[PDB]
Amino acid sequence: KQPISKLTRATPGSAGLDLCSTSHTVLTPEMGPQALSTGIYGPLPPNTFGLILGRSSITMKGLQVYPGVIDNDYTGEIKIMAKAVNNIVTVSQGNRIAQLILLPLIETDNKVQ
Amino acid sequence: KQPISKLTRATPGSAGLDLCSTSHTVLTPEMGPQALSTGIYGPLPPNTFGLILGRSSITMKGLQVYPGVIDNDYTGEIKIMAKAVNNIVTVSQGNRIAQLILLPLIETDNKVQ
Amino acid sequence: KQPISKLTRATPGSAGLDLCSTSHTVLTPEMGPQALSTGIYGPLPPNTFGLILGRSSITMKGLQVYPGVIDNDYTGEIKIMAKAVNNIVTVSQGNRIAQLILLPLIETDNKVQ
Ligand SMILES: O=c1ccn([C@H]2C[C@H](O)[C@@H](COP(=O)(O)O)O2)c(=O)[nH]1
Ligand SMILES: O=c1ccn([C@H]2C[C@H](O)[C@@H](COP(=O)(O)O)O2)c(=O)[nH]1
Ligand SMILES: O=c1ccn([C@H]2C[C@H](O)[C@@H](COP(=O)(O)O)O2)c(=O)[nH]1
């Protein structure tokens, strides 16, 4: 398993950490949402949560990444939820498919469970 | 009307507050976006705004929730904008359909109106 | 070129800054994602990044805006990635199509490039 600390940022001003698909995968529109493996696992730094978002270059090529909320204490594998919009899309191993944004986790008094 | 304070968090490390649909509703792809009632109303805690996002279990079952921005001072009913992706989806009363994330509302000098 | 400082907020409690399309554009579902020009350019205020999100009134009328991450140091034109969901959609010049949300850019030790 690899932790979020092994992810890289493309440039210092980049909001997101790059997420790559560990497999070659073909997607068609009729398949609906598919969860792509990344080999990267939670959890997140204290007081943060994560959002998985698309890369614009990839969205413009017809692969939609559904925004995904990564809880602070999730310890499973971070997967990318994606769908081919209109056309057949092929994702090659190591292609950068999405990005992870880290955001502050605000405290509230809402009851738990 | 019920306020956001009555929402619950599944676990202490959960980023989102659960939102449930108050009605049983059937959605098909050709229907396009539908606004699901929740019986929960703004406004939000000072200096925050809200984002409505999907639950990954629900997105993987073919119901897409369009990310929705909840303004700090909105006092209407928070509705979930959703679409069946490819298949017929049935939402039962009380099913958890989406989640509300609270985020800091940054001040800027942009002119207002 | 116009900077983000020229954008306006609809009301003081509005989370987003309004983004308008500078052209008249017709979109159909089979076209897939389209990048709409706005004439607004990065970069963003220090320690922030941007998210492009839809307006709910517009999403409910069948135009989906794909959430887009605006990096802090991007100096190009901010474009709106959008898709007609099911029907033909016509966007007129000056119509408010999306909104820009500003969020804190959290520092991490992740390696760069
Ligand atoms: O795109 C996503 C969305 C969620 N999850 C994992 C992390 C979340 O903590 C967990 C539960 O999802 P939600 O209930 O937060 O949506 O699933 C992902 O791997 N990818
Ligand atoms: O998914 C959504 C998106 C918005 N709204 C309500 C709250 C917002 O303050 C208001 C106006 O929407 P926007 O203009 O912020 O998108 O509509 C919802 O109930 N659900
Ligand atoms: O909806 C979007 C998404 C991105 N970009 C520009 C700003 C980003 O800094 C840049 C690279 O996109 P990403 O790699 O962050 O997705 O493209 C846009 O104009 N509109």
Side-chain angles (χ1 to χ4, degrees), chain B residues 29-30 32-33 49 51 64 66 69 71-73 81 83 106 108 110 112, chain C residues 4-5 7-15 17 53 56 59-60 64 85-86 102:
Chain B
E30 70 273 7
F49 73 97
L51 285 178
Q64 168 176 16
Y66 299 100
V69 173
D71 296 306
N72 177 264
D73 53 357
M81 298 187 293
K83 184 186 166 278
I106 285 177
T108 77
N110 298 83
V112 170
Chain C
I4 272 152
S5 56
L7 299 179
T8 54
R9 206 175 284 285
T11 71
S14 298
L17 299 165
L53 298 161
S56 60
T59 305
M60 293 299 308
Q64 168 176 16
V85 164
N86 270 156
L102 290 182

PDB file of all heavy atoms in Angstrom, chain B residues 29-30 32-33 49 51 64 66 69 71-73 81 83 106 108 110-113, chain C residues 4-5 7-15 17 53 56 59-60 64 85-86 102, unseen atoms left out:
ATOM      1  N   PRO B  29     -32.820   8.058 -17.084  1.00  0.00           N
ATOM      2  CA  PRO B  29     -31.855   8.987 -17.735  1.00  0.00           C
ATOM      3  C   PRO B  29     -32.506  10.107 -18.549  1.00  0.00           C
ATOM      4  O   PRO B  29     -32.101  11.285 -18.436  1.00  0.00           O
ATOM      5  CB  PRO B  29     -31.043   8.058 -18.616  1.00  0.00           C
ATOM      6  CG  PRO B  29     -31.127   6.675 -17.871  1.00  0.00           C
ATOM      7  CD  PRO B  29     -32.557   6.650 -17.362  1.00  0.00           C
ATOM      8  N   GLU B  30     -33.574   9.788 -19.273  1.00  0.00           N
ATOM      9  CA  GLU B  30     -34.176  10.818 -20.113  1.00  0.00           C
ATOM     10  C   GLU B  30     -34.832  11.913 -19.323  1.00  0.00           C
ATOM     11  O   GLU B  30     -35.124  12.969 -19.889  1.00  0.00           O
ATOM     12  CB  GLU B  30     -35.156  10.204 -21.139  1.00  0.00           C
ATOM     13  CG  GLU B  30     -36.440   9.660 -20.502  1.00  0.00           C
ATOM     14  CD  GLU B  30     -36.298   8.228 -20.033  1.00  0.00           C
ATOM     15  OE1 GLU B  30     -35.144   7.623 -20.056  1.00  0.00           O
ATOM     16  OE2 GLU B  30     -37.418   7.716 -19.677  1.00  0.00           O
ATOM     17  N   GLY B  32     -33.393  13.741 -17.116  1.00  0.00           N
ATOM     18  CA  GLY B  32     -32.479  14.864 -16.787  1.00  0.00           C
ATOM     19  C   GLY B  32     -32.478  15.230 -15.307  1.00  0.00           C
ATOM     20  O   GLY B  32     -32.938  14.424 -14.458  1.00  0.00           O
ATOM     21  N   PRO B  33     -31.871  16.391 -14.972  1.00  0.00           N
ATOM     22  CA  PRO B  33     -31.706  16.717 -13.563  1.00  0.00           C
ATOM     23  C   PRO B  33     -32.999  16.903 -12.813  1.00  0.00           C
ATOM     24  O   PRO B  33     -33.918  17.559 -13.298  1.00  0.00           O
ATOM     25  CB  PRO B  33     -30.890  18.020 -13.590  1.00  0.00           C
ATOM     26  CG  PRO B  33     -30.108  17.910 -14.904  1.00  0.00           C
ATOM     27  CD  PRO B  33     -31.135  17.322 -15.853  1.00  0.00           C
ATOM     28  N   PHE B  49     -19.726  28.105   3.853  1.00  0.00           N
ATOM     29  CA  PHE B  49     -20.766  27.810   2.844  1.00  0.00           C
ATOM     30  C   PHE B  49     -20.785  26.279   2.717  1.00  0.00           C
ATOM     31  O   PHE B  49     -19.976  25.577   3.326  1.00  0.00           O
ATOM     32  CB  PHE B  49     -20.433  28.476   1.499  1.00  0.00           C
ATOM     33  CG  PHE B  49     -19.285  27.824   0.743  1.00  0.00           C
ATOM     34  CD1 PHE B  49     -19.538  26.880  -0.291  1.00  0.00           C
ATOM     35  CD2 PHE B  49     -17.979  28.152   1.029  1.00  0.00           C
ATOM     36  CE1 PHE B  49     -18.477  26.300  -1.001  1.00  0.00           C
ATOM     37  CE2 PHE B  49     -16.897  27.546   0.311  1.00  0.00           C
ATOM     38  CZ  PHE B  49     -17.148  26.629  -0.688  1.00  0.00           C
ATOM     39  N   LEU B  51     -21.284  22.617   0.353  1.00  0.00           N
ATOM     40  CA  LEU B  51     -21.276  21.919  -0.944  1.00  0.00           C
ATOM     41  C   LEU B  51     -22.007  20.620  -0.791  1.00  0.00           C
ATOM     42  O   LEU B  51     -21.719  19.858   0.106  1.00  0.00           O
ATOM     43  CB  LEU B  51     -19.882  21.502  -1.389  1.00  0.00           C
ATOM     44  CG  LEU B  51     -18.892  22.510  -1.932  1.00  0.00           C
ATOM     45  CD1 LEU B  51     -17.604  21.762  -2.218  1.00  0.00           C
ATOM     46  CD2 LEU B  51     -19.363  23.274  -3.189  1.00  0.00           C
ATOM     47  N   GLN B  64     -26.158  10.075 -10.158  1.00  0.00           N
ATOM     48  CA  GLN B  64     -25.158  11.154 -10.119  1.00  0.00           C
ATOM     49  C   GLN B  64     -25.764  12.332  -9.354  1.00  0.00           C
ATOM     50  O   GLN B  64     -26.897  12.784  -9.617  1.00  0.00           O
ATOM     51  CB  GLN B  64     -24.847  11.643 -11.505  1.00  0.00           C
ATOM     52  CG  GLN B  64     -24.052  12.931 -11.470  1.00  0.00           C
ATOM     53  CD  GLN B  64     -23.664  13.339 -12.861  1.00  0.00           C
ATOM     54  OE1 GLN B  64     -24.215  12.841 -13.851  1.00  0.00           O
ATOM     55  NE2 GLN B  64     -22.724  14.232 -12.964  1.00  0.00           N
ATOM     56  N   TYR B  66     -25.171  16.239  -8.770  1.00  0.00           N
ATOM     57  CA  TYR B  66     -24.435  17.364  -9.277  1.00  0.00           C
ATOM     58  C   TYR B  66     -23.987  18.201  -8.091  1.00  0.00           C
ATOM     59  O   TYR B  66     -24.852  18.529  -7.232  1.00  0.00           O
ATOM     60  CB  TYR B  66     -25.285  18.244 -10.197  1.00  0.00           C
ATOM     61  CG  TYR B  66     -25.789  17.528 -11.412  1.00  0.00           C
ATOM     62  CD1 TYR B  66     -27.091  17.034 -11.500  1.00  0.00           C
ATOM     63  CD2 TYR B  66     -24.939  17.323 -12.455  1.00  0.00           C
ATOM     64  CE1 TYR B  66     -27.553  16.324 -12.643  1.00  0.00           C
ATOM     65  CE2 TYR B  66     -25.384  16.640 -13.586  1.00  0.00           C
ATOM     66  CZ  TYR B  66     -26.656  16.165 -13.683  1.00  0.00           C
ATOM     67  OH  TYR B  66     -27.010  15.523 -14.862  1.00  0.00           O
ATOM     68  N   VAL B  69     -23.682  24.360  -4.693  1.00  0.00           N
ATOM     69  CA  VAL B  69     -23.169  25.332  -3.766  1.00  0.00           C
ATOM     70  C   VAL B  69     -24.330  25.878  -2.921  1.00  0.00           C
ATOM     71  O   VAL B  69     -25.308  26.370  -3.444  1.00  0.00           O
ATOM     72  CB  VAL B  69     -22.548  26.486  -4.546  1.00  0.00           C
ATOM     73  CG1 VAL B  69     -22.129  27.627  -3.632  1.00  0.00           C
ATOM     74  CG2 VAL B  69     -21.375  25.991  -5.351  1.00  0.00           C
ATOM     75  N   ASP B  71     -25.294  28.763  -0.424  1.00  0.00           N
ATOM     76  CA  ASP B  71     -24.784  30.023   0.073  1.00  0.00           C
ATOM     77  C   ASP B  71     -24.998  30.117   1.582  1.00  0.00           C
ATOM     78  O   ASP B  71     -25.968  29.532   2.133  1.00  0.00           O
ATOM     79  CB  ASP B  71     -25.500  31.117  -0.676  1.00  0.00           C
ATOM     80  CG  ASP B  71     -25.156  31.063  -2.176  1.00  0.00           C
ATOM     81  OD1 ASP B  71     -23.933  31.073  -2.524  1.00  0.00           O
ATOM     82  OD2 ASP B  71     -26.071  30.924  -3.032  1.00  0.00           O
ATOM     83  N   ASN B  72     -24.154  30.936   2.196  1.00  0.00           N
ATOM     84  CA  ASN B  72     -24.203  31.086   3.688  1.00  0.00           C
ATOM     85  C   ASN B  72     -25.571  31.535   4.168  1.00  0.00           C
ATOM     86  O   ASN B  72     -26.092  31.051   5.205  1.00  0.00           O
ATOM     87  CB  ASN B  72     -23.144  32.067   4.161  1.00  0.00           C
ATOM     88  CG  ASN B  72     -23.218  32.286   5.672  1.00  0.00           C
ATOM     89  OD1 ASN B  72     -23.828  33.246   6.146  1.00  0.00           O
ATOM     90  ND2 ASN B  72     -22.675  31.364   6.411  1.00  0.00           N
ATOM     91  N   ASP B  73     -26.183  32.454   3.431  1.00  0.00           N
ATOM     92  CA  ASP B  73     -27.423  33.092   3.894  1.00  0.00           C
ATOM     93  C   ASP B  73     -28.673  32.530   3.226  1.00  0.00           C
ATOM     94  O   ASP B  73     -29.798  33.113   3.357  1.00  0.00           O
ATOM     95  CB  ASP B  73     -27.318  34.582   3.657  1.00  0.00           C
ATOM     96  CG  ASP B  73     -26.936  34.914   2.188  1.00  0.00           C
ATOM     97  OD1 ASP B  73     -26.683  34.017   1.311  1.00  0.00           O
ATOM     98  OD2 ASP B  73     -26.901  36.124   1.942  1.00  0.00           O
ATOM     99  N   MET B  81     -29.602  17.851  -6.334  1.00  0.00           N
ATOM    100  CA  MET B  81     -29.793  17.812  -7.824  1.00  0.00           C
ATOM    101  C   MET B  81     -29.213  16.476  -8.284  1.00  0.00           C
ATOM    102  O   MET B  81     -28.037  16.253  -8.069  1.00  0.00           O
ATOM    103  CB  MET B  81     -29.013  18.943  -8.499  1.00  0.00           C
ATOM    104  CG  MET B  81     -29.551  20.312  -7.997  1.00  0.00           C
ATOM    105  SD  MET B  81     -28.843  21.658  -8.888  1.00  0.00           S
ATOM    106  CE  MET B  81     -27.100  21.538  -8.354  1.00  0.00           C
ATOM    107  N   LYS B  83     -29.329  12.848 -11.078  1.00  0.00           N
ATOM    108  CA  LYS B  83     -29.691  12.334 -12.395  1.00  0.00           C
ATOM    109  C   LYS B  83     -29.347  10.878 -12.441  1.00  0.00           C
ATOM    110  O   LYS B  83     -28.263  10.484 -12.051  1.00  0.00           O
ATOM    111  CB  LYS B  83     -28.985  13.087 -13.528  1.00  0.00           C
ATOM    112  CG  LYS B  83     -29.518  12.544 -14.917  1.00  0.00           C
ATOM    113  CD  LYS B  83     -28.849  13.068 -16.128  1.00  0.00           C
ATOM    114  CE  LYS B  83     -29.172  12.238 -17.428  1.00  0.00           C
ATOM    115  NZ  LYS B  83     -28.350  10.958 -17.658  1.00  0.00           N
ATOM    116  N   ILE B 106     -14.245  32.463   2.265  1.00  0.00           N
ATOM    117  CA  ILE B 106     -13.167  33.437   2.209  1.00  0.00           C
ATOM    118  C   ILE B 106     -13.702  34.792   1.807  1.00  0.00           C
ATOM    119  O   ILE B 106     -14.461  34.908   0.855  1.00  0.00           O
ATOM    120  CB  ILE B 106     -12.138  32.958   1.163  1.00  0.00           C
ATOM    121  CG1 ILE B 106     -11.344  31.790   1.766  1.00  0.00           C
ATOM    122  CG2 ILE B 106     -11.152  34.083   0.733  1.00  0.00           C
ATOM    123  CD1 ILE B 106     -10.336  31.190   0.792  1.00  0.00           C
ATOM    124  N   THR B 108     -13.271  38.481   0.080  1.00  0.00           N
ATOM    125  CA  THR B 108     -12.531  39.142  -1.008  1.00  0.00           C
ATOM    126  C   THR B 108     -13.127  40.555  -1.165  1.00  0.00           C
ATOM    127  O   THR B 108     -14.179  40.850  -0.602  1.00  0.00           O
ATOM    128  CB  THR B 108     -12.640  38.377  -2.369  1.00  0.00           C
ATOM    129  OG1 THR B 108     -13.929  38.612  -2.973  1.00  0.00           O
ATOM    130  CG2 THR B 108     -12.447  36.855  -2.202  1.00  0.00           C
ATOM    131  N   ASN B 110     -14.163  41.640  -4.019  1.00  0.00           N
ATOM    132  CA  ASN B 110     -15.005  41.706  -5.203  1.00  0.00           C
ATOM    133  C   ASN B 110     -16.287  42.465  -4.871  1.00  0.00           C
ATOM    134  O   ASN B 110     -16.851  42.296  -3.791  1.00  0.00           O
ATOM    135  CB  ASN B 110     -15.337  40.329  -5.790  1.00  0.00           C
ATOM    136  CG  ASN B 110     -14.096  39.561  -6.252  1.00  0.00           C
ATOM    137  OD1 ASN B 110     -13.421  38.904  -5.434  1.00  0.00           O
ATOM    138  ND2 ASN B 110     -13.858  39.542  -7.557  1.00  0.00           N
ATOM    139  N   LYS B 111     -16.721  43.284  -5.828  1.00  0.00           N
ATOM    140  CA  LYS B 111     -17.931  44.083  -5.675  1.00  0.00           C
ATOM    141  C   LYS B 111     -19.124  43.175  -5.589  1.00  0.00           C
ATOM    142  O   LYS B 111     -19.116  42.070  -6.134  1.00  0.00           O
ATOM    143  CB  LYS B 111     -18.094  45.075  -6.826  1.00  0.00           C
ATOM    144  CG  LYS B 111     -17.258  46.352  -6.678  1.00  0.00           C
ATOM    145  N   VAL B 112     -20.155  43.644  -4.894  1.00  0.00           N
ATOM    146  CA  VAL B 112     -21.353  42.854  -4.636  1.00  0.00           C
ATOM    147  C   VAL B 112     -22.579  43.343  -5.429  1.00  0.00           C
ATOM    148  O   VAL B 112     -23.044  44.461  -5.228  1.00  0.00           O
ATOM    149  CB  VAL B 112     -21.650  42.823  -3.131  1.00  0.00           C
ATOM    150  CG1 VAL B 112     -22.990  42.222  -2.873  1.00  0.00           C
ATOM    151  CG2 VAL B 112     -20.580  42.069  -2.386  1.00  0.00           C
ATOM    152  N   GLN B 113     -23.097  42.484  -6.310  1.00  0.00           N
ATOM    153  CA  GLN B 113     -24.222  42.779  -7.209  1.00  0.00           C
ATOM    154  C   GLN B 113     -23.793  43.723  -8.328  1.00  0.00           C
ATOM    155  O   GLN B 113     -23.428  43.287  -9.420  1.00  0.00           O
ATOM    156  CB  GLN B 113     -25.437  43.340  -6.451  1.00  0.00           C
TER     157      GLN B 113
ATOM    158  N   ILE C   4      -9.542  38.318 -11.942  1.00  0.00           N
ATOM    159  CA  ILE C   4     -10.602  37.811 -11.123  1.00  0.00           C
ATOM    160  C   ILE C   4     -11.219  38.907 -10.230  1.00  0.00           C
ATOM    161  O   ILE C   4     -12.373  38.816  -9.810  1.00  0.00           O
ATOM    162  CB  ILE C   4     -10.112  36.555 -10.362  1.00  0.00           C
ATOM    163  CG1 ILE C   4     -10.373  35.329 -11.262  1.00  0.00           C
ATOM    164  CG2 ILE C   4     -10.786  36.416  -9.018  1.00  0.00           C
ATOM    165  CD1 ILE C   4      -9.438  34.213 -11.034  1.00  0.00           C
ATOM    166  N   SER C   5     -10.427  39.939  -9.945  1.00  0.00           N
ATOM    167  CA  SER C   5     -10.936  41.046  -9.138  1.00  0.00           C
ATOM    168  C   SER C   5     -12.096  41.766  -9.796  1.00  0.00           C
ATOM    169  O   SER C   5     -12.802  42.479  -9.105  1.00  0.00           O
ATOM    170  CB  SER C   5      -9.844  42.076  -8.838  1.00  0.00           C
ATOM    171  OG  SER C   5      -9.245  42.565 -10.028  1.00  0.00           O
ATOM    172  N   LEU C   7     -14.626  40.254 -11.234  1.00  0.00           N
ATOM    173  CA  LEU C   7     -15.856  39.461 -11.041  1.00  0.00           C
ATOM    174  C   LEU C   7     -16.692  40.034  -9.935  1.00  0.00           C
ATOM    175  O   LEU C   7     -16.173  40.661  -8.993  1.00  0.00           O
ATOM    176  CB  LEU C   7     -15.524  38.002 -10.678  1.00  0.00           C
ATOM    177  CG  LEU C   7     -14.733  37.255 -11.754  1.00  0.00           C
ATOM    178  CD1 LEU C   7     -14.411  35.809 -11.294  1.00  0.00           C
ATOM    179  CD2 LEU C   7     -15.529  37.252 -13.077  1.00  0.00           C
ATOM    180  N   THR C   8     -17.999  39.755 -10.000  1.00  0.00           N
ATOM    181  CA  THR C   8     -18.872  40.216  -8.909  1.00  0.00           C
ATOM    182  C   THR C   8     -19.587  39.068  -8.219  1.00  0.00           C
ATOM    183  O   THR C   8     -19.754  37.976  -8.763  1.00  0.00           O
ATOM    184  CB  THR C   8     -19.932  41.262  -9.375  1.00  0.00           C
ATOM    185  OG1 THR C   8     -20.675  40.722 -10.465  1.00  0.00           O
ATOM    186  CG2 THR C   8     -19.240  42.546  -9.804  1.00  0.00           C
ATOM    187  N   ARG C   9     -19.993  39.363  -6.995  1.00  0.00           N
ATOM    188  CA  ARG C   9     -20.698  38.437  -6.126  1.00  0.00           C
ATOM    189  C   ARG C   9     -22.140  38.942  -6.168  1.00  0.00           C
ATOM    190  O   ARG C   9     -22.366  40.172  -6.123  1.00  0.00           O
ATOM    191  CB  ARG C   9     -20.105  38.606  -4.724  1.00  0.00           C
ATOM    192  CG  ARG C   9     -20.203  37.430  -3.853  1.00  0.00           C
ATOM    193  CD  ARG C   9     -19.493  37.635  -2.525  1.00  0.00           C
ATOM    194  NE  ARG C   9     -18.016  37.538  -2.605  1.00  0.00           N
ATOM    195  CZ  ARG C   9     -17.306  36.415  -2.735  1.00  0.00           C
ATOM    196  NH1 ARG C   9     -17.913  35.232  -2.871  1.00  0.00           N
ATOM    197  NH2 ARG C   9     -15.971  36.475  -2.771  1.00  0.00           N
ATOM    198  N   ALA C  10     -23.106  38.030  -6.286  1.00  0.00           N
ATOM    199  CA  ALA C  10     -24.511  38.429  -6.419  1.00  0.00           C
ATOM    200  C   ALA C  10     -25.001  39.117  -5.147  1.00  0.00           C
ATOM    201  O   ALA C  10     -25.690  40.139  -5.197  1.00  0.00           O
ATOM    202  CB  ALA C  10     -25.393  37.234  -6.756  1.00  0.00           C
ATOM    203  N   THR C  11     -24.636  38.565  -4.003  1.00  0.00           N
ATOM    204  CA  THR C  11     -25.060  39.104  -2.726  1.00  0.00           C
ATOM    205  C   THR C  11     -23.863  38.948  -1.804  1.00  0.00           C
ATOM    206  O   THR C  11     -22.959  38.150  -2.098  1.00  0.00           O
ATOM    207  CB  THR C  11     -26.240  38.290  -2.124  1.00  0.00           C
ATOM    208  OG1 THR C  11     -25.763  37.005  -1.691  1.00  0.00           O
ATOM    209  CG2 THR C  11     -27.360  38.085  -3.139  1.00  0.00           C
ATOM    210  N   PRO C  12     -23.820  39.716  -0.701  1.00  0.00           N
ATOM    211  CA  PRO C  12     -22.746  39.469   0.272  1.00  0.00           C
ATOM    212  C   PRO C  12     -22.581  38.029   0.836  1.00  0.00           C
ATOM    213  O   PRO C  12     -21.488  37.684   1.253  1.00  0.00           O
ATOM    214  CB  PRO C  12     -23.021  40.494   1.395  1.00  0.00           C
ATOM    215  CG  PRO C  12     -24.401  41.043   1.138  1.00  0.00           C
ATOM    216  CD  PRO C  12     -24.659  40.881  -0.326  1.00  0.00           C
ATOM    217  N   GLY C  13     -23.623  37.195   0.864  1.00  0.00           N
ATOM    218  CA  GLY C  13     -23.471  35.868   1.510  1.00  0.00           C
ATOM    219  C   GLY C  13     -23.226  34.770   0.428  1.00  0.00           C
ATOM    220  O   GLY C  13     -23.099  33.552   0.749  1.00  0.00           O
ATOM    221  N   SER C  14     -23.164  35.208  -0.826  1.00  0.00           N
ATOM    222  CA  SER C  14     -22.942  34.291  -1.974  1.00  0.00           C
ATOM    223  C   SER C  14     -21.561  33.712  -1.902  1.00  0.00           C
ATOM    224  O   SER C  14     -20.585  34.434  -1.744  1.00  0.00           O
ATOM    225  CB  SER C  14     -23.073  34.999  -3.326  1.00  0.00           C
ATOM    226  OG  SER C  14     -24.400  35.495  -3.470  1.00  0.00           O
ATOM    227  N   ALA C  15     -21.476  32.396  -2.040  1.00  0.00           N
ATOM    228  CA  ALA C  15     -20.202  31.745  -1.933  1.00  0.00           C
ATOM    229  C   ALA C  15     -19.399  32.006  -3.189  1.00  0.00           C
ATOM    230  O   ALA C  15     -18.175  32.029  -3.121  1.00  0.00           O
ATOM    231  CB  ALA C  15     -20.422  30.283  -1.748  1.00  0.00           C
ATOM    232  N   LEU C  17     -18.304  33.651  -7.131  1.00  0.00           N
ATOM    233  CA  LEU C  17     -18.201  34.811  -8.018  1.00  0.00           C
ATOM    234  C   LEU C  17     -18.799  34.421  -9.370  1.00  0.00           C
ATOM    235  O   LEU C  17     -18.450  33.394  -9.939  1.00  0.00           O
ATOM    236  CB  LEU C  17     -16.743  35.240  -8.188  1.00  0.00           C
ATOM    237  CG  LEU C  17     -16.037  35.655  -6.900  1.00  0.00           C
ATOM    238  CD1 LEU C  17     -14.440  35.716  -7.081  1.00  0.00           C
ATOM    239  CD2 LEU C  17     -16.558  36.985  -6.438  1.00  0.00           C
ATOM    240  N   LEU C  53     -17.804  25.854 -10.407  1.00  0.00           N
ATOM    241  CA  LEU C  53     -18.954  25.011 -10.167  1.00  0.00           C
ATOM    242  C   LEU C  53     -20.139  25.551 -10.913  1.00  0.00           C
ATOM    243  O   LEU C  53     -20.193  26.728 -11.294  1.00  0.00           O
ATOM    244  CB  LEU C  53     -19.310  24.859  -8.634  1.00  0.00           C
ATOM    245  CG  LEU C  53     -18.147  24.195  -7.873  1.00  0.00           C
ATOM    246  CD1 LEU C  53     -18.257  24.474  -6.355  1.00  0.00           C
ATOM    247  CD2 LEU C  53     -18.051  22.722  -8.241  1.00  0.00           C
ATOM    248  N   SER C  56     -27.121  26.329  -9.703  1.00  0.00           N
ATOM    249  CA  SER C  56     -28.155  25.323  -9.680  1.00  0.00           C
ATOM    250  C   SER C  56     -29.265  25.606 -10.675  1.00  0.00           C
ATOM    251  O   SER C  56     -29.831  24.656 -11.250  1.00  0.00           O
ATOM    252  CB  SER C  56     -28.767  25.213  -8.259  1.00  0.00           C
ATOM    253  OG  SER C  56     -29.339  26.441  -7.851  1.00  0.00           O
ATOM    254  N   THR C  59     -27.858  24.161 -13.942  1.00  0.00           N
ATOM    255  CA  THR C  59     -27.886  22.707 -13.934  1.00  0.00           C
ATOM    256  C   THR C  59     -29.312  22.134 -14.094  1.00  0.00           C
ATOM    257  O   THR C  59     -29.532  21.163 -14.849  1.00  0.00           O
ATOM    258  CB  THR C  59     -27.347  22.244 -12.548  1.00  0.00           C
ATOM    259  OG1 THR C  59     -26.060  22.822 -12.325  1.00  0.00           O
ATOM    260  CG2 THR C  59     -27.250  20.685 -12.477  1.00  0.00           C
ATOM    261  N   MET C  60     -30.315  22.754 -13.446  1.00  0.00           N
ATOM    262  CA  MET C  60     -31.681  22.267 -13.528  1.00  0.00           C
ATOM    263  C   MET C  60     -32.283  22.483 -14.924  1.00  0.00           C
ATOM    264  O   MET C  60     -33.242  21.791 -15.280  1.00  0.00           O
ATOM    265  CB  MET C  60     -32.540  22.874 -12.405  1.00  0.00           C
ATOM    266  CG  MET C  60     -32.134  22.404 -11.046  1.00  0.00           C
ATOM    267  SD  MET C  60     -32.280  20.632 -10.788  1.00  0.00           S
ATOM    268  CE  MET C  60     -33.975  20.418 -11.327  1.00  0.00           C
ATOM    269  N   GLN C  64     -24.731  20.956 -17.692  1.00  0.00           N
ATOM    270  CA  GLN C  64     -23.873  20.463 -16.602  1.00  0.00           C
ATOM    271  C   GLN C  64     -22.523  21.176 -16.704  1.00  0.00           C
ATOM    272  O   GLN C  64     -21.887  21.246 -17.775  1.00  0.00           O
ATOM    273  CB  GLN C  64     -23.607  18.993 -16.757  1.00  0.00           C
ATOM    274  CG  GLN C  64     -22.505  18.531 -15.826  1.00  0.00           C
ATOM    275  CD  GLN C  64     -22.333  17.043 -15.924  1.00  0.00           C
ATOM    276  OE1 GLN C  64     -22.815  16.404 -16.868  1.00  0.00           O
ATOM    277  NE2 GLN C  64     -21.660  16.472 -14.969  1.00  0.00           N
ATOM    278  N   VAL C  85     -26.876  17.994 -21.079  1.00  0.00           N
ATOM    279  CA  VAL C  85     -27.111  16.679 -20.484  1.00  0.00           C
ATOM    280  C   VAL C  85     -27.936  15.771 -21.431  1.00  0.00           C
ATOM    281  O   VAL C  85     -27.503  14.657 -21.802  1.00  0.00           O
ATOM    282  CB  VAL C  85     -27.790  16.901 -19.092  1.00  0.00           C
ATOM    283  CG1 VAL C  85     -28.428  15.646 -18.546  1.00  0.00           C
ATOM    284  CG2 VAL C  85     -26.781  17.520 -18.103  1.00  0.00           C
ATOM    285  N   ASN C  86     -29.128  16.282 -21.773  1.00  0.00           N
ATOM    286  CA  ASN C  86     -30.078  15.504 -22.561  1.00  0.00           C
ATOM    287  C   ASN C  86     -30.664  16.186 -23.790  1.00  0.00           C
ATOM    288  O   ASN C  86     -31.098  15.484 -24.750  1.00  0.00           O
ATOM    289  CB  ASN C  86     -31.243  15.068 -21.644  1.00  0.00           C
ATOM    290  CG  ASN C  86     -30.996  13.748 -20.983  1.00  0.00           C
ATOM    291  OD1 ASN C  86     -31.567  13.451 -19.933  1.00  0.00           O
ATOM    292  ND2 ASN C  86     -30.154  12.930 -21.594  1.00  0.00           N
ATOM    293  N   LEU C 102     -13.529  30.341  -4.096  1.00  0.00           N
ATOM    294  CA  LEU C 102     -12.118  30.467  -3.697  1.00  0.00           C
ATOM    295  C   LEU C 102     -11.944  29.656  -2.416  1.00  0.00           C
ATOM    296  O   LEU C 102     -12.749  29.770  -1.480  1.00  0.00           O
ATOM    297  CB  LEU C 102     -11.767  31.921  -3.453  1.00  0.00           C
ATOM    298  CG  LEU C 102     -11.734  32.724  -4.762  1.00  0.00           C
ATOM    299  CD1 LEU C 102     -11.316  34.162  -4.405  1.00  0.00           C
ATOM    300  CD2 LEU C 102     -10.695  32.219  -5.776  1.00  0.00           C
TER     301      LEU C 102
END
